[PDB]
Design an enzyme around this catalytic site. Structure first.
Site, mmCIF file in Angstrom:
data_model
loop_
_atom_site.group_PDB
_atom_site.id
_atom_site.type_symbol
_atom_site.label_atom_id
_atom_site.label_comp_id
_atom_site.label_asym_id
_atom_site.label_seq_id
_atom_site.Cartn_x
_atom_site.Cartn_y
_atom_site.Cartn_z
ATOM 1 C CE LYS A 12 -44.416 -76.787 -34.324
ATOM 2 N NZ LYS A 12 -44.710 -77.769 -35.396
ATOM 3 C CD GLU A 42 -49.265 -82.497 -33.069
ATOM 4 O OE1 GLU A 42 -48.401 -82.996 -32.318
ATOM 5 O OE2 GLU A 42 -49.395 -81.266 -33.224
ATOM 6 N NE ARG A 43 -52.638 -80.281 -27.603
ATOM 7 C CZ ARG A 43 -51.350 -79.986 -27.519
ATOM 8 N NH1 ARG A 43 -50.582 -79.941 -28.593
ATOM 9 N NH2 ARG A 43 -50.818 -79.733 -26.329
#
Ligand code: ATP
Ligand code: MG
Lengths: 46, 530, 486, 146
Positions: free
Chosen positions: C162, C188-189
């Protein structure tokens, strides 16, 4: 499998909604039963 | 002894472990999320944490200890400081309360509410952390600085994996320098005091307390302690991270923390959400797990590895807490009930298990083996799909998949050399002629015995399985290297030939009422011996 | 403006919700306030007004932790909404909700700032007609063409490359359309954000010593919900500047859009609002609308957004995805099965969709070719299953020419990306829209029925196919000639 | 305005489904008892007082008309939804657009099997009524045969 999955995904959505509604109803009941008392402040001092 | 500074008010209401304070004359203020001492007795104090600051001046307090001694109208003092707990190498090998107090058994200060490293202060996960289990180390790699969930149902082997992982580091920390040693921090939340003691004995038996610390907030301790235990645990681990060392924090378990936080919020009249949990539950877990990282070389290169544990009721991963944890962690290890009852222990369901880090958290030797091992097992499952009747046909992929799925059964963690060698042997087909029932016995002889020396046939000069120091040579030089490849194949070929000639031949010739039982007992013992 | 520097005092503190009392009157809603007292805090504290309790008291959401916060603490209004820097100086830099560079790479040195919250373009500013966005990728520009002013859902997790697709889109849009890109990491991480930054610097999309073509805006999980619910708007504001001032076709990536919905849901719960079905906020539709509607193609420029969607519990009827899908003008499905088939980009052409797949928008030839490709692929599936019970030798010669063309199509929809010119070693390709249409149209007719199947694998355009076929033929001839010698 | 004056009109609400969400948003912000699917109890009355204003006035009042074509969005072809049923309980007929037909190239994808007009039969033109009389039987047989 496509008809029992829909009823399983429709059931989880209804279950979450009802449980949350119950809790908020109890929260509103305990808020409504509560009444504010006379305010003991220096109202004139303003 | 938290140092009291000034009186901030008087206790007004008590609801179990939650209290309220009314302001003292002059309406002195108290800093939010700070520590307060309630003068329960003439010279004794009860610890409390500020949680709410109401407009009228009332203060919400979470009690932490000596709750039975708290009464309305008592005096409250404030410390004006966040929670700081003792930390350092002087805490290892001890049971510690989330407040920093030591728990009797039969260096500096660290903030318990600290931010996580920023983007620029982190580095990619490359250093591996060995759990001691072939299944995890191969199909679900775990790297230092990674956050790997352990999700499973009750009595499935969750606590065992984490404890074994902690123990597996004892044999490694003793050999390599303390710089690369892994220091373990096991956090028990809402468990029994009995289980903590048994875990304490178990760690002491293998000598892990020297490199491990236990933080306990057991049942019968107020919910406030159970809510702060993970944060204190990472604070102990972050001390080593900011000093170029590596830490491993285990939480057993986050499911009970969320319940305690729910209890606190509801008793303090906060807006509930899904499953009655507050709206900060996701933020609570995120700011806990995000503190586990892998610092860049410019900040020492330390790391914290997180192994949160979660209990899924009736194999439902759709619960609020479970989904939030899964969405935060970098992968998951799923322990399945059916496999556990099926003799597969560890019960890892490799289909549902995942590691987003991938091969980057694997050693060169392990990476080479896993590259082919993953492919073979998938074919075995697909061909096993047709194995429900139809008399499944034993192709080479299946002939090797069965052995792989039988080598993954183990009780204690495996030394890297023993595990990698056994997987390599099964990968190249040395076990094709070995029946699936005798694989564990074959592995035991390979590891703890040496057939070649027994029969005076070994010709290898240095490559022998009793040389436990070859592990680091194998780590530096992959098994598929000319230095070790030649002797490795020779030893495997010789061991396989001797085993088939002497042992398996006798096994297939067993015809008696007592020999069969002795063979069965031997196989079971070897199953849990390696 | 008249409330610039206005003074107030903290009156209540309950978690991330803080009530401030102003003697001169609360500033307008969505106003930003700064806590002057940094007594023991390691970071500055900023609050956003969300509600008015009375003529003097106002409720606010803290963007950071509210630790060491006392009542009656002084607070100063900033004079307006949150301000974010906008300009060409933000390229190649990382920002947060407050528009502060967190990359530790020196001062931004911007020349202007814009408010986070801006009204969506009016009905009179909308584009006259729909236009296609040539992404340079054969599959996307043929079977699911993107649209200017469009919102595209990139369904499919990671492990399918992705991030590589995202980087390729960023490079191609600037290469062809000369438009920049803004990436917004919502919930988001932190680890993945670091990896993405390193990959971008490695692919030169973010050139520290040169010119970058991408901005980053990260609100991570560890940040409180007040930040994760405004990071996207900050990134959107940056894109709006390029759309309006510079008149460009900008890109806006969101990772993910679900985290944005979840953040607002948590914020609404903190304020005490009654949640709607499945525990979501009552303002779910309005929150998304105030964001997506700002993403459109105007008369000056356009903003095409590629949003990464996540379906909770794999339930496509859940209110979050259900409300989101109504705003999406295209779908891109990334599947591991296709990637494991060696097809990169791993896109399932039959699972994707687009609304501009209509002759009234795209050229008639484009529409006819795309429908023909889809029909052939669908037939290839049924034929694939027929041979399982029969064997290809049984199929009719129409269905054995149709099983040969289809395989060529599947191989021809793969493409080597220039972003991977380094880690894969193969020169990238940027196939033009017209070239792709002609190449597929010729293939469907049967002109290229003599070219070997593998000549279409990881190539761009039709000329590349011919060149690869010639090289394969030359290699085969040399090998045969060498064999005859021995 | 046009109906009261003897003229005709056609109103297209696109769509009443999103009106209910907005009304639900307003009600919940006012902290009112949520109902089924968290919609307020008077959500039915919201659409009742709307569609009832669409009517064909008698000759005495002018013969005006306001035809109404409300629109509603389902999920996975679910006509058992709370809002969907309420509107179906108010309107005089329904046009169902099956997703499968639409994706199969059969547009406008009018699922004649589920669609119905409860009062429109009389208004049908004489010419089309002649053609449609037999068409109904032909389609009915065709569905059964396949
Ligand atoms: N790999 C293993 N092989 C064999 N037995 C095992 C293994 N791991 C755990 N067990 C056994 O399984 C049982 C459950 O183990 P454990 O205590 O780890 O469960 P758990 O996941 O912590 O469950 P809970 O904490 O909810 O009781 C124990 O009897 C333990 O000895
Ligand atoms: Mg346990």
């Amino acid at each position: 499998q496509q008809r029992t999955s829909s009823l399983y995904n429709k059931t989880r959505q209804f279950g979450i909604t009802a449980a949350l509604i119950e809790i908020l109803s109890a929260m509103s009941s305990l808020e409504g039963n509560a009444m504010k008392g006379v305010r003991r402040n220096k109202f004139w001092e303003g | 002894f938290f140092k009291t500074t000034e009186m901030i008010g008087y206790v007004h209401s008590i609801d179990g472990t939650i209290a309220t304070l009314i302001p003292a004359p002059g309406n002195p203020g108290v800093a939010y999320n700070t520590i307060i001492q309630i003068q329960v007795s003439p010279t004794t104090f009860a610890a409390g944490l500020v949680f709410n600051l109401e407009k009228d001046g009332r203060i919400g307090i979470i009690l932490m200890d000596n709750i039975t001694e708290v009464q309305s109208g008592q005096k409250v003092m404030a410390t004006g400081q966040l929670l700081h707990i003792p930390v350092g190498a002087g805490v290892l090998g001890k049971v510690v309360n989330p407040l920093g107090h030591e728990v009797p058994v039969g260096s500096t200060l660290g903030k318990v509410d600290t931010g996580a490293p920023n983007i620029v202060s982190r580095s990619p996960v490359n250093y591996n952390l060995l759990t001691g289990f072939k299944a995890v180390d191969t199909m679900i790699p775990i790297g230092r600085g990674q956050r790997e969930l352990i999700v499973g149902d009750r009595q499935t082997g969750k606590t065992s994996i984490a404890v074994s992982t902690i123990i597996n580091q004892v044999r490694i920390n003793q050999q390599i320098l303390s710089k690369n040693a892994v220091i373990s921090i096991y956090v028990s939340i809402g468990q029994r005091c009995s289980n903590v003691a048994r875990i304490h004995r178990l760690l002491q038996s293998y000598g892990a307390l020297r490199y491990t610390t236990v933080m306990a907030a057991t049942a019968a301790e107020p919910a406030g302690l159970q809510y702060l235990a993970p944060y204190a645990g990472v604070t102990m681990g972050e001390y080593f991270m900011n000093r170029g060392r590596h830490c491993l924090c285990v939480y057993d378990d986050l499911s009970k923390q969320a319940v305690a936080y729910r209890q606190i919020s509801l008793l303090l009249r906060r807006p509930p959400g899904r499953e009655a949990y507050p709206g900060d539950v996701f933020y609570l877990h995120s700011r806990l797990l995000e503190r586990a990282a892998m610092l860049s070389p410019g900040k020492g290169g330390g790391s914290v590895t997180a192994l949160p544990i979660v209990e899924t009721l009736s194999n439902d991963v759709t619960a609020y807490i479970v989904t939030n944890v899964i969405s935060i962690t970098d992968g998951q290890i799923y322990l399945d009930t059916k496999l556990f009852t099926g003799g597969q222990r560890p019960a890892v369901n490799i289909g549902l298990s995942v590691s987003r880090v991938g091969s980057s958290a694997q050693n060169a030797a392990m990476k080479g083996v896993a590259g082919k091992l993953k492919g073979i097992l998938a074919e075995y499952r697909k061909l096993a799909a047709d194995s429900v009747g139809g008399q499944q046909v034993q192709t080479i992929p299946m002939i090797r998949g069965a052995r792989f799925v039988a080598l993954f059964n183990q009780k204690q963690p495996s030394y890297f050399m023993n595990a990698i060698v056994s997987l390599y042997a099964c990968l190249n087909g040395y076990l094709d002629d070995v029946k699936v029932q005798y694989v564990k016995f074959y592995e035991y002889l390979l590891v703890h015995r040496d057939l070649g020396i027994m029969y005076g046939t070994a010709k290898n000069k240095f490559f022998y399985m009793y040389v436990q120091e070859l592990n680091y040579l194998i780590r530096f030089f992959t098994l598929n290297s000319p230095i070790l490849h030649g002797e490795l194949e020779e030893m495997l070929k010789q061991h396989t030939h001797l085993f088939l000639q002497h042992y398996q031949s006798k096994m297939n010739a067993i015809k008696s009422e007592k020999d069969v039982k002795a063979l069965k007992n031997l196989l079971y013992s070897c199953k849990r011996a390696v | 403006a008249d409330h610039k520097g206005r003074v107030g005092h903290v009156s209540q503190v309950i978690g991330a919700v803080v009530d401030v009392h102003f003697a001169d009157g609360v500033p307008p809603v969505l106003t930003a306030l700064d806590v002057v007292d940094k007594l023991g805090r390691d970071e500055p504290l900023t609050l956003e007004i969300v509600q008015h309790l009375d003529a003097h008291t106002g409720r606010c959401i803290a963007m950071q932790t509210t630790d060491l916060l006392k009542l009656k603490a002084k607070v100063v209004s900033t004079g307006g909404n949150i301000s974010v820097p906008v300009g060409r100086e933000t390229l190649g830099r990382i920002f947060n909700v407050l528009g502060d560079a967190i990359d530790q790479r020196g001062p931004v040195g911007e020349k202007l700032r814009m408010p986070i919250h801006a009204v969506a373009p009016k009905l009179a500013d909308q584009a006259a007609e729909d236009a296609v966005l040539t992404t340079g990728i054969k599959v996307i520009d043929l079977i699911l063409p993107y649209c200017k002013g469009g919102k595209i859902g990139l369904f499919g997790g990671a492990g399918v490359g992705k991030t590589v697709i995202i980087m390729e889109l960023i490079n191609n849009v600037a290469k062809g359309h000369g438009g920049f890109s803004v990436f917004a990491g919502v919930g988001e991480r932190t680890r993945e954000g670091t990896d993405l930054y390193l990959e971008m610097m490695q692919s030169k999309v973010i050139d520290l010593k040169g010119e970058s073509k991408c901005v980053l805006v990260y609100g991570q999980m560890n940040e409180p919900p007040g930040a994760r619910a405004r990071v996207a708007q900050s990134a959107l504001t940056m894109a709006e500047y390029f759309r309006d001032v510079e008149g460009q076709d900008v890109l806006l990536f969101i990772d993910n859009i679900f985290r944005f919905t979840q953040a607002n849901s948590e914020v609404s719960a903190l304020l005490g609002r009654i949640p709607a079905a499945v525990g979501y906020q009552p303002t779910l539709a309005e929150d998304l609308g105030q964001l997506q509607e700002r993403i459109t193609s105007t008369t000056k420029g356009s903003i095409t957004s590629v949003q990464a969607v996540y379906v909770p519990a794999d339930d496509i009827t859940d209110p979050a995805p259900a409300t989101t899908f109504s705003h999406l003008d295209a779908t891109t499905v990334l599947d591991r099965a296709v990637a494991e088939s060696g097809i990169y980009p791993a896109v399932n052409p039959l699972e994707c969709a687009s609304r501009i797949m209509d002759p009234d928008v795209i050229s008639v030839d484009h529409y006819n070719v795309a429908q023909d490709v889809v029909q052939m692929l669908t037939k290839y599936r049924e034929l694939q299953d027929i041979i399982a019970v029969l064997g290809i030798d049984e199929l009719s010669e129409e269905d054995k020419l149709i099983v040969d063309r289809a395989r060529k199509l599947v191989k021809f929809l793969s493409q080597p990306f220039q972003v991977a010119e380094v880690f894969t070693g193969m020169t990238g390709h940027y196939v033009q829209l017209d070239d792709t249409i002609d190449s597929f149209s010729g293939l469907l007719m049967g002109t290229y029925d003599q070219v070997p199947e593998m000549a279409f694998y990881m190539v761009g355009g039709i000329n590349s196919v011919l060149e690869k076929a010639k090289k394969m033929a030359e290699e085969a001839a040399e090998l045969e000639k060498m064999r005859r010698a021995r």
